Design a protein around this nucleic acid. Structure first.
Length: 295
DNA sequence: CTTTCCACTTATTCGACCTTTTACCC
DNA sequence: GGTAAAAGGTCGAATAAGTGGAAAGG
């Protein structure tokens, strides 16, 4: 088991970390409700190692299957939440998820005082939960109708370690095959992209200045609105993006995708993508990265 | 009772992907 | 005549968040 750099861990949490506050109907409870407070990450089986490493880094949490194709790390044992708070107090989140963390911290304090054992603290936890992630459930939105009433987070990228973490969840290393009527028949284009909910526009815009390259693609759709930070200029990929992740290590199978991407970059730098042979090799590498990778 | 764990589900959030247009090069 | 860069824009599933039930344990 390997230890994860704390800022890489925070970046990955900004991407995929999920805070939880269960407030459940419970007849065997003196107040009528029981609670469970925590932090979790659920991902594809192929990246179970990440969870194990996080588990090894913090020395907390339990790992369990999440259906047939996924696996989770869940931390809800109360004393162990202190580890999580100490971590994020030293290496804070910078996306809108910071808001959720804050609510989680609030909940922690309530439960630390054991106030969740009386009805007043249950009410307070419901008020906190109302602003957390998806907010109140329908059942809770019937038992507490008086509870109905979030400020934008705006924070800077702290360093490239954070970026390695975040890119491990929200980034994509892609080999694009531009098809035409040329004798070669295809233009090879490396693409780097990071994709994120439009509420974090400030952060996404800042990637352009932080990395010194790229541009934003905006998506305004019926099911979601988001931004892609994109780099397609080869000299920026080769001289800026690749060095960043060579010194700030990605986690998960995406590291392999990055390494394959770098192979193609080498071929493009040598102009071998302008030959049938090198082209065939590139197509071969592309075939087996991202969705094509075998585990 | 209360906390913690473990099997399992929902519905999001787009990563990953391909096409088409525009910009620039020899 | 080329190749490079950006823009345009889809969608299936791995996320993100949550749920049911019960053992563990104080």
């Amino acid at each position: 088991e390997e230890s994860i750099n704390p800022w890489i861990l925070t970046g990955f949490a900004d991407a995929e970390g999920s805070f939880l506050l269960r407030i459940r109907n419970n007849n065997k409870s003196s107040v009528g409700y029981s609670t469970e407070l925590g932090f979790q990450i659920t991902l594809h089986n192929k990246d179970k190692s990440i969870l194990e490493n996080i588990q090894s880094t913090w020395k907390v949490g339990v790992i369990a299957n999440s259906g047939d194709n996924a696996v989770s790390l869940k931390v809800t044992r109360f004393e162990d939440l202190k580890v999580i708070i100490d971590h994020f107090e030293k290496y804070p989140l910078i996306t809108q998820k910071l808001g959720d963390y804050m609510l989680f911290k609030q909940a922690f304090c309530v439960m630390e005082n054991k106030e969740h054992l009386k009805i007043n603290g249950i009410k307070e936890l419901v008020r906190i939960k109302a602003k957390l992630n998806w907010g109140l459930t329908d059942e809770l939105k019937k038992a507490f109708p008086e509870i109905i009433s979030r400020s934008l987070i705006n924070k800077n990228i702290p360093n490239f370690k954070w970026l390695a973490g975040f890119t491990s969840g929200e980034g994509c290393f892609f080999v694009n095959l531009i098809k035409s009527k040329s004798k070669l028949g295809v233009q090879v284009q490396l693409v780097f992209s990071i994709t994120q909910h439009i509420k974090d526009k400030n952060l996404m815009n800042s990637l352009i200045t932080y990395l010194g390259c790229g541009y934003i693609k905006e998506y305004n759709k019926s099911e979601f609105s988001w931004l892609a930070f994109v780099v397609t200029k080869f000299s920026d990929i080769n001289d800026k993006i690749i060095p960043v992740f060579q010194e700030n290590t990605l986690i998960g199978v995406k590291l392999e995708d990055f390494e394959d991407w770098c192979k193609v970059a080498k071929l493009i730098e040598e102009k071998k993508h302008l030959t049938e042979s090198g082209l065939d090799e590139i197509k071969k590498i592309k075939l087996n990265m991202n969705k094509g990778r075998v585990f």
